[PDB]
Design a protein around this ligand. Sequence first.
Ligand SMILES: O=C(O)Cc1ccccc1Nc1c(Cl)cccc1Cl
Ligand SMILES: COc1ccc2cc([C@H](C)C(=O)O)ccc2c1
Length: 580
Amino acid sequence: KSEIAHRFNDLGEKHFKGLVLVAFSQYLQQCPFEDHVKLVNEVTEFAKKCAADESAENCDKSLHTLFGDKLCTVATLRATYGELADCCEKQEPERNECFLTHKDDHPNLPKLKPEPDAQCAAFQEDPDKFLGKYLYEVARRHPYFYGPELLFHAEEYKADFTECCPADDKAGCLIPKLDALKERILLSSAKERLKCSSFQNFGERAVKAWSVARLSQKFPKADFAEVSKIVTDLTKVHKECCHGDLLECADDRADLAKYICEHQDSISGKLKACCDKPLLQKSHCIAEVKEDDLPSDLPALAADFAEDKEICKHYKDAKDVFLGTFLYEYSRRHPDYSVSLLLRIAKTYEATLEKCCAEADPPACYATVFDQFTPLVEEPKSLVKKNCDLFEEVGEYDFQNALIVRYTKKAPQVSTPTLVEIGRTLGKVGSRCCKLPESERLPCSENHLALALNRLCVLHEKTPVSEKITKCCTDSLAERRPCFSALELDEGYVPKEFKAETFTFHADICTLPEDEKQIKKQSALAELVKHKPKATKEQLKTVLGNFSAFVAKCCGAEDKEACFAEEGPKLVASSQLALA
Ligand SMILES: O=C(O)Cc1ccccc1Nc1c(Cl)cccc1Cl
Ligand SMILES: COc1ccc2cc([C@H](C)C(=O)O)ccc2c1
């Protein structure tokens, strides 16, 4: 009857306001903060009004109608948001869909540097404004961030400024925390963007399948029934959030978290610490909970899925339940597999039964079906061992460079910053995963990879440069990682013409902190590969190392610029002979 009243009542004012700010910040990334505060308070006041009389004029309008009307009042409409002023001409649900379509994955706003004195001051002087501003900035930059979860991260950014601001050295307490949080923010944005990307490109079925797999791994004690129910609910939550209905999403998420904690005895024995928490902390804990111990009573799958004579019938009767079942069972006995691998396996099963069940004698045909799985498992296992050996041996930086090269050879049309960012992200998978026990590295690796390759793909949607990437991004959610692995030097490349200034470093680099130095040299590394695509990886390691030494020494010098000026051109000219 009054959606706005109903969400204001279930969520409470704090989480209601927060979520409406987040939603606004994502729909209008370019709109200044103060403009959004007033719109939030404005809509929020209306909610209150409606909550006390749901018959009041306009209280029965859809959320969209109310929210889109609010956004379409924001000043400097056409100048600041060109393409979004056209959306305000529309009725809902066209209008909502045009907003949604014009969200910007790489708005490329200033990097968020902590100002610890000036922010503690703003924290103590007005914490609501201060926390609000954090939601705004993160939302702004990650327009598909998982709404309820951002409020959770806003609670940790509060806990942080709370403990460090009263302290002696605010900047020493606060900076490593705010760095850890940014890392968690980025990972979380990447997981949610993979969810939204899967809806957009593959549909709701592909999200269900993914979620059956992962929840079955996580909750192996649970019966198919119960995973199905959680998955149906979880898929609706994320569909909503992804489509921007953040208030609905949060409300539904809290009901799901209630449910799971109502039923943990029949879901998992790890939900116990999670269930003794406030709403946001609990939902978060459930969402990241460790995998439960395997049960002693796991069935043998062979009889039911490869030996049974009734398999084609069972399968023509309800494919999706038969397949969902195989996926649930295979998944829960395999936490040591990646989600994507589990889904390639299911897709091979399904394929084997469609081929075999139309054949002359199907059971002889599907008898060996589990053996089709074996090379699918060997492949990413080998990859992971091979990349972790490399990592263990050369370290993060060089492993990142190995990858910058590998990827620049595959898609040398990608801008340098993208290639650098993706090789760096990929190399950090190295860091996180290679150190885990031997049976956790394949899932760690391939699950985090999926996150990074989706980032790449999302960027490429905005700024398309390469048919090879378009193909790999669209052909199969489960096949992405193998599709990217199989890519080799684009022979279609005409080498990029040499511009000396691109390889030419100056004293400006010596100021930069360590990460920012690497980004520069890694940027030159990408550029080296674009001019000389056939250069071997060892030739580029030596040329890069000679650029490192060169930079280390000239930065170490009494006259930095005369050092760069004298020695730089020699190194630019000679290092082109050392490549191809
Ligand atoms: O690139 C690889 O796959 C591994 C490899 C093997 C031998 C020598 C160098 C590299 N990788 C690599 C590259 Cl391509 C550039 C800079 C530094 C390093 Cl360690
Ligand atoms: C364990 O650590 C890694 C890190 C990066 C990787 C990148 C790739 C890409 C997809 C590639 O094209 O080979 C594969 C495996 C990887 C394992």
